[PDB]
């Protein structure tokens, strides 16, 4: 597991890769910004954001919830995401 997370290639462990693939990823190797890209696609596509208060994402009965280990997060409090990423990315 990484401690500190430009252009550097990551390989996501299988649980994360599944979510990125559902989001549309055609790849096994990603940049960090390609991971964030597909992660936001996933929330969009699955409509996990709260529809009145769209900074809030409800991820509780979803494979993403399982990864983040929270029922909800705020896009303005992105810690659960960054922490999940260092738990789920192999940094070569």
């Amino acid at each position: 597991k990484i401690r500190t997370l430009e252009g550097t290639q990551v390989h996501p462990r299988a649980p994360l890769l599944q979510i990125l693939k559902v989001a549309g990823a055609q790849e096994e190797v990603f940049t960090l910004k390609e991971v964030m890209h597909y992660l936001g696609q996933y929330i969009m596509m699955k409509q996990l954001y709260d529809k009145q208060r769209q900074h809030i994402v409800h991820c509780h009965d979803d494979p993403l919830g399982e990864l983040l280990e929270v029922g909800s997060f705020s896009v303005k409090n992105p810690s659960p995401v960054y922490e999940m990423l260092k738990r789920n990315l192999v940094i070569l």
């Binding site: 964030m36 936001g40 929330i43 969009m44 769209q54 900074h55 994402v57 896009v75 992105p78």
Partner: peptide, 11 residues
């Protein structure tokens, strides 16, 4: 604001 506007506004 929409979720995707908020999302791309991230470090």
């Amino acid at each position: 604001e929409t979720f995707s506007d908020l999302w791309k506004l991230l470090p």
